[PDB]
Amino acid sequence: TSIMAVTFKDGVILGADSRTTTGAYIANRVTDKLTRVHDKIWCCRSGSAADTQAIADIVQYHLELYTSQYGTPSTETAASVFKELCYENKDNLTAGIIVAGYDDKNKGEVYTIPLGGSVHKLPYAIAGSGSTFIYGYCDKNFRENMSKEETVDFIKHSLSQAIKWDGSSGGVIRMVVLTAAGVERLIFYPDEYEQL
Amino acid sequence: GYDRHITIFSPEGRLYQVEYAFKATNQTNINSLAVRGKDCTVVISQKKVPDKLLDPTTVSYIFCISRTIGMVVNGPIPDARNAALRAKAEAAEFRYKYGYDMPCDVLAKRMANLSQIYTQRAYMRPLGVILTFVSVDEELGPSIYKTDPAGYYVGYKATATGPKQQEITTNLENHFKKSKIDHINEESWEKVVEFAITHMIDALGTEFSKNDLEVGVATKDKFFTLSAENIEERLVAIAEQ
Amino acid sequence: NNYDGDTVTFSPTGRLFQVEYALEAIKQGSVTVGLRSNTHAVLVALKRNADELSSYQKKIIKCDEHMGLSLAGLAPDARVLSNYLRQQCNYSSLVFNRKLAVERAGHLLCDKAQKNTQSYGGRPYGVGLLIIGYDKSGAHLLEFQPSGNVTELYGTAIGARSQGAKTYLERTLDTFIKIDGNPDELIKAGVEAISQSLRDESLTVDNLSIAIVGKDTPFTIYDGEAVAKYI
Amino acid sequence: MTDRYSFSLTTFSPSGKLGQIDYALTAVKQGVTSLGIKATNGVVIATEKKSSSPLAMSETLSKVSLLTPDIGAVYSGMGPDYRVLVDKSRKVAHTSYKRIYGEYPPTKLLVSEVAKIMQEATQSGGVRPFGVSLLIAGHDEFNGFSLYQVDPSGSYFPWKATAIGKGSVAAKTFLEKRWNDELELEDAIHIALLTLKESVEGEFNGDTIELAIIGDENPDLLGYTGIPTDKGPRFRKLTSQEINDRLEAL
Amino acid sequence: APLX
Amino acid sequence: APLX
Amino acid sequence: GSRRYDSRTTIFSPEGRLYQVEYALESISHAGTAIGIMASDGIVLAAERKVTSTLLEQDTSTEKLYKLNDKIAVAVAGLTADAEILINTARIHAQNYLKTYNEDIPVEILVRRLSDIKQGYTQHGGLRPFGVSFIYAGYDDRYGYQLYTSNPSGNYTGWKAISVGANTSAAQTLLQMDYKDDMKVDDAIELALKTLSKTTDSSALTYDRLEFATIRKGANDGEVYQKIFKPQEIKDILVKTGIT
Amino acid sequence: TGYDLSNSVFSPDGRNFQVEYAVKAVENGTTSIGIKCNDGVVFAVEKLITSKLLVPQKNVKIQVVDRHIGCVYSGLIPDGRHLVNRGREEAASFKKLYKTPIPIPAFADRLGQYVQAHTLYNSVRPFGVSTIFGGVDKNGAHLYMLEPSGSYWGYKGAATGKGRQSAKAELEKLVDHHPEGLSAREAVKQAAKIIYLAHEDNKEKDFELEISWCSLSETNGLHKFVKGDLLQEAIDFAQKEIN
Amino acid sequence: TTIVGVKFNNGVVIAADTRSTQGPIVADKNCAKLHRISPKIWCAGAGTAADTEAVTQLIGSNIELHSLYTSREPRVVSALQMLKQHLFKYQGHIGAYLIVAGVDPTGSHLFSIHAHGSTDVGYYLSLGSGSLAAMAVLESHWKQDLTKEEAIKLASDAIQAGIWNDLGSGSNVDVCVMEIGKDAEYLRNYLTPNVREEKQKSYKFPRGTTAVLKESIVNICD
Amino acid sequence: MDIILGIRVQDSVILASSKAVTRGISVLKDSDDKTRQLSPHTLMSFAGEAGDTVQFAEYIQANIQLYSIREDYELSPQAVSSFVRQELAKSIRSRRPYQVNVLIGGYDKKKNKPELYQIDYLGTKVELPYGAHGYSGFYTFSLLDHHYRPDMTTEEGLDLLKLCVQELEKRMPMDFKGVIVKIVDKDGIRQVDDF
Amino acid sequence: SDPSSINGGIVVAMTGKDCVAIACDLRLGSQSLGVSNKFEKIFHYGHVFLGITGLATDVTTLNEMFRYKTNLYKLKEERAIEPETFTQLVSSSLYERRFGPYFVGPVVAGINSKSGKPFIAGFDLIGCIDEAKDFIVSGTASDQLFGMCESLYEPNLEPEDLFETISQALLNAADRDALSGWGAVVYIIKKDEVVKRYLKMRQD
Ligand SMILES: [Cl-]
Ligand SMILES: [Cl-]
Ligand SMILES: [Mg+2]
């Protein structure tokens, strides 16, 4: 996998490739690694497909129950529920998860949860096998308070490179935009992003 | 007569604790009513704030169980909230286990089964509540299903509950007799709410200000309650009529 | 009357009769007194015997180096509660390297007793306790009743005819509260307080029981020839 | 907290009656009439859908229930007790039979399991007996068609035809006159519809009568084709319309 | 097993 | 144990 | 607490009787009479049904006589539902013995364990006893043909002939009168039916108010066969002895 | 009858008499109040001075839950402590799983459900306290009162115990005479007055006043006790008014 | 095994070969790898043979009970959720690899489930040892907007690639078609392209060829 | 442990069992009786893991004796052997299985036949004319295949057994210190004292 | 250390015209050592026949278990269990022990007494049903049996012809396996008579 989430002026954008691997065989070339746990709290999944799905399903369930009793949960709260699962079951889980959401108070927020179940709040986050190849690039090109179009370009260019070098990344680039205006799904195909 | 304290049969084959639980249903002295539109299900209930010291916004007998299900209770508030918390948990679990939103009628059945158990197992008392569940089901359309302390439940064209229930019931029966249909033949939920308030006024023979009522609307893909202002807007339109 | 069958039943005036009957065994108990200054805290207890061939039932139990108590009522119940206190003081040491606050000891006993006043099958404790100690905020005296009510006091007394001592201490307050840096004077005042509760009997050498704790004195108990000094 | 009622709530009185079972039967007496008739090529079970309010939609309340594709049940007594018994009966058909033998249980054995559940509510700690009598109509390959009545005690009996609840005494007499061992299923439906009018006060149509059959296999009701040894459910609920068709030729 |  |  | 509603099913009266056992026995005394008679060459089980309706499906029915294994059957007087609980237990217990020892369970051993279960309900657990008495009829190669009874107390005893349920006083007197040790099975069949005929609370004994079983060596050579009579077979045996 | 001898039994009117008897124990207790204000809440309670021998300031009765919630109660004191202990576990587990401190409405239902649970079985007894509690969360200030039945609502002001009526009347005046809102430091003084006024109905024994508060501006949304110059100042304001 | 699923216009179709292997040995030449979960939800299974049968029956049973309890026709996503959560609980030790498909009140659906419990959504899928041979065909010929007959051809073509090119797959092609508004049609042995040729000789023996020591009649009766 | 044999002749079952008990490089004992009487007409010999053998044998003995007292009756050799097999068959899937092999020799008084059962630690039961456990069988089975006849007398059986012990003393690597021989017949169980 | 080949042995079953045959060898060994020459691997429960190969202790245990289960079945159902049903019961029972299985290869054969149809089936150790028109094989010489059966077998053999065919498949497979043989039994099963024949075979 290659995944990332980036905060900007109006909120946050999540991005991911669409490759699921089963050896060196591509088991699924159009996977959706961007996953809803609440209306405007989403996550990017990396690591074990089974582990991350099982985790996201439980988190979605907790937040649905949270909503019923106490109203809309904060992005921080959602990240806390992911952590609790990942940390307490660290021996049996291979899950690298980025949590991203939009409050109206807090605007865009990104929390990354690596293998051990630690939590890290960041302006942007990258993860997955393909992320190693774009630490250089992303650190050099990220700024705070980018526009929507700048942020789409940053993610598109970054994941383009991760996909280029990482054999475990590929297919389409998916993105999910999270603002006050609602929720927008974007998709970019190889013929566009490859030759960037 | 210890067959009167726990839920075992009396010599005439009755459950007094269940019957007395029904009497606790009216302890609050509120009347509720529910009707179905074309696109929606409306439930209205009287809101009575006696004490001036209460925060009126925290006084409610309508509950949002899930995104799509609402529930109004007739009965004391502790039992009402007990039932609401359980319903919320059951509806969330159902979604997780089976991958789709719990239907109004299935939730009603499930809560009814839970109530049935209290009528059979001795250590649990029945809850002194009647639960009216409402939604716009994705398969069945606008839905009203109601539960009582006996563990009985059924679907309704429309319904009412409370001390002056029979007045409201016959008022509604007389309308459907005349209208010849299953529901309120109205496009917007705003007008179905207006119908509901109007026929509650006639049957009870009383007027309402914005703070005397409490309204819940179920549409396709959300159930919500109205503010004092959305109700005022609604009372105004009934007056100009 | 119809409402005293168990602790889980309120009477129509909102009373708990089993708790009240538990309070009654305290009243049949031999008198005991607590009082304190700013530097020390003292327990005095009148011990009761079966007859002239018997021992005099102990009423004072050490809980830690800085804490201990006196009992009035059912003695086995004091043993259970004092043993719980020993553990709680102990846990505070091993885990936090911290001597247990007398106030917390109070709160812990209250909560332990209360559980037995709300659940079926159990029963309230049938004993009253006077807890003294010296901790990070000085000398303390507590009164425990098995209703779960715990109260911090300059002085008090419990058991039969304890009202004599409790009156005496109420007048004496301004004196004994300021017996600082003098162990033997605080004890003398305690022994006098208890004497206001005697009838047809006076304090003998194998009848009186005293304990003291404070600034530089570990909780210690005096019996037998060690109390002759005070008669 | 928790259930501290571990002792029986049903015990023998000095005369030898078990009070709670007797009282449960009294609750069944109060209940709306239901019946079953056994034909040579089918069984019919029927009851009155006596509605609580006319604002209630009584199609949403099913008194006659499918248990297996070849077994159905109806009751008289307390509706909620019946509802949870059906839930439990459906499940036990799977857990204690289908998941073991790969086929649905024969009528007598499913009945036997329901009876067990009802017997346990008569002796286990902290519960009262079920306030219902069931009539279970069913078919299986080696026993053919059968009809059973199950009572609050857990006792069951096989019947040619019977009735339970309110007007059972009268209805049982009616059925003795009309029943013979040569009834074709249509004749049994007809007799059931006649017997039921005696005990119904108000409206008597396909919206107030609930009626189901155990008869021929229904391939059209199966949902799929391509396994020729799977032929479809013998249980069928008659529609509102189907009943009214048989009431004009009454 | 499937990875991402 | 057979496979498919 | 819940102590208020506890009947205390397992206590002694001041006379040293077990109330619930006594009251269970009282319940059983209104049940259809069942009779067991033991011959030198077999055993008979006969029992009267609780008063029939003409519409009862009588051939696919069983209320009184149950098969425990191939060599042992019981006749029931009391609550049928209670009896089935115990019958399945007994059936399982028989199979455990066979599985363990590769030999069919001796009759007494089966009878003892069932009676031990009943006994338990009278001493602990605070539950009501089982309202059932059994007549056990079976064969094993230690004692041959055996009859036993058990009742809600969990007490059991062996018999040459015995009755349970209604009118056992009259029935026992009649069996005592006509029973004799050298009796064959076919004589015992007659004695059983004649005894029910005279003790019945019905007007006259017919095939449709009966259940009937034999346990003979009347298969082929040194092995045993249970015959649970079909209705038509009872109708014939009722004629064959001139009761109808 | 005999309907009133066992918790969780419905009488023929539909009442649980054991809960009603628990209310008598509440009515028998000392007076306690809460006043909701602009950006917070204030809690006050009368402590009866049984004797000279009670160490003043040293039998504290108001209790904190988490860092932002205050609780006070009238009736059986140990029952109230038991309830607050549970409240503390409920708040800890909420904060553990969800990170944020427990919202006040959320907290109210946790106690409510727990108290209501003790009216479901005959093997437990109802709580012998009415509890006033509240604090500040992300949505502002909330005050709540909770009864032995499990019933609770939000309040502008609330009172319970022997002086509940006297205090209720006094609260009703403030709500009418300050419709735009009452400040935190105002409420502290008013609370002192009302406890002094409601002490009329309990006046053999004289009493010790105890106050606490959470205010977004005055305590930074944290629960603190009122002591020293602020307590004495509010005592003085109360003394003025009963003369 | 080879198994596939292909969506079309108005429903979904699944197919499977019919070979079972015990190492290099063909254990079963004609086993059914298509399972009915409910009347209009069918499952194709690869992996440990007993596991796919057992897990499919268990969830089929619970779906039936659920359908009865809710008075609704079962949905594919319920089978999906129940299967995946069961398989996840067993951490891969239940070796069931499934393509789940069906029609329900929501529409037509196609999913795959791997033994550790991850699920996939697609218009065309393949699993088993022959999944690469099949997927090569699917990637070559699949298009958006297939008719029912195109989908059936595509599916069985994909299974055929497995039969011919994969040693783990052989014998026949089974198909199941689940169209919206219609009954599922289960086409057992839809294709039979591996009919054994006529043998050269009959090996029927002269009677009495086999030397016997003893005979006896066995008692099956009572 | 090591050597246990059994031969069933016309009218009895003969069990021969080695006397040595060896641990390490020391023969600790040369007079060990590797047998327990289960009932007056049933005998069981045993060999296997140290400790397990006696613990198992005595446990079976206790169970059979209990049955005898309860029913005032002697269980048949077939019944006892089936009980023993089931116990071992349970054991093999326990947390720690009994590693014990047994021969059960009994005289069935209802049938008037001697019977020999060979059961291994897995619960594998077989009725045999002659039996052995461990490496012993590798010499004796073939020898007995040759010399054994179904209708032999008890004396003929003992001579046949002398042949087996002689062969084992010639070809076995270990000194098993001779055998204790016991005869089970219609009159019960007795021990031959000079072998 | 492979429990399925410690004791050795084989079972084969075949269908014919209105008949079935099921056969097994008689060997029970402990690896190289032959121990018993009388160890039959075929059992019956009424008219349903079950052959079991594999670990002998489990063979014995499972026979005892299915006798138990079919005896109770008969008492409750008031009829003998049929092969299709028994097959399902075998499957359930083995899969119930999924993660600690019986090391066996069972084979079911019999004629359905209602429909008259001949029926055979085989199972793996964890319950997978293999139903077949023609033949089922099991045991340490299963490769050989597969070879013998696949070449010798033809449909619709008369009982006395089927006997020769199944016997020759068994004998010649057994002779190429060191752990199978030492005797053999063949059951010929018609709708209501069953003949049992012991074969003469090489004793090495
Ligand atoms: Cl995924
Ligand atoms: Cl339920
Ligand atoms: Mg050889």
CATH topology of chain A: Glutamine Phosphoribosylpyrophosphate, subunit 1, domain 1
How far apart are the termini of chain A?
20 Å
Annotation field: number of helices of chain J? 4
Q: What helical percentage do the residues of chain J reach?
A: 25-40%
The percent range for helix content of chain A is 25-40%
- CATH superfamily (homologous) name of chain A: Aminohydrolase, N-terminal nucleophile (Ntn) domain
Broad shape of chain A: globular
Tell me the layout of helices and strands:
This is part of a larger assembly, with 11 protein chains of 10 kinds.
Chain A: E1 3-8, E2 11-16, E3 20-21, E4 26-28, E5 34-38, E6 41-47, H1 49-70, H2 75-88, E7 95-102, E8 108-113, E9 120-122, E10 124-127, H3 135-141, H4 148-165, E11 173-179, E12 182-188, H5 190-193
Antiparallel strand pairs in A: 1-2, 1-10, 2-11, 3-4, 5-6, 6-7, 7-8, 8-9, 11-12
Helix pairs in contact in A: 1-2
Chain C: H1 17-27, E1 32-36, E2 40-46, E3 60-64, E4 67-73, H2 75-96, H3 102-115, E5 127-135, E6 138-144, E7 150-152, E8 155-158, H4 162-176, H5 183-195, E9 208-214, E10 217-222, H6 225-228
Antiparallel strand pairs in C: 1-2, 1-8, 2-9, 3-4, 4-5, 5-6, 6-7, 9-10
Helix pairs in contact in C: 2-3, 4-5
Chain H: H1 17-27, E1 32-37, E2 40-48, E3 63-65, E4 69-75, H2 77-98, H3 104-117, E5 129-137, E6 140-146, E7 152-154, E8 157-160, H4 164-177, H5 184-198, E9 207-215, E10 223-225, H6 228-242
Antiparallel strand pairs in H: 1-2, 1-8, 2-9, 3-4, 4-5, 5-6, 6-7, 9-10
Helix pairs in contact in H: 2-3, 4-5, 5-6
The structure holds chloride ion (2 copies) and magnesium ion.
One chloride ion binds next to α1 of chain A.
Description:
This is part of a larger assembly, with 11 protein chains of 10 kinds. With 196 residues, chain A is an alpha+beta fold. Chain A has 5 helices and 12 strands. In chain A, the strands form 3 sheets. A 5-stranded antiparallel β-sheet of chain A has the order 10-1-2-11-12. In chain A, strands 5-6-7-8-9 form a 5-stranded antiparallel β-sheet, covered by helices on one side. In chain A, a hairpin with a 6-residue loop joins strand 8 (108-113) and strand 9 (120-122). In chain A, helix 1 (49-70) crosses helix 2 (75-88). The N and C termini of chain I lie far apart (46 Å). Chain I has one domain: Aminohydrolase, N-terminal nucleophile (Ntn) domain (Glutamine Phosphoribosylpyrophosphate, subunit 1, domain 1, 4-Layer Sandwich). The longest helix of chain I is centred in the N-terminal third of the chain and has 22 residues, at 49-70. Chain I has helices at residues 49-70, 76-89, 131-141, 148-165; strands at 3-8, 11-16, 20-22, 25-28, 34-38, 41-47, 96-104, 107-113, 119-121, 124-127, 173-179, 184-191, 212-218. Helices cover 29% and strands 34% of the residues of chain I. Chain I is of the alpha+beta class and 222 residues long. Chain I has 4 helices and 13 strands. Chain B binds chain H through residues 4-6, 16-17, 20-27, 52-55, 57-59, 76-79, 81-82, 85, 123-126, 128, and chain H through 2-3, 6, 8-15, 36, 105, 109, 112-113, 115-116, 119-123, 143, 149-158, 168, 171-172, 175-176. Strand 13 (212-218) of chain I pairs antiparallel with strand 12 (193-199) of chain K, so a sheet runs across the interface.
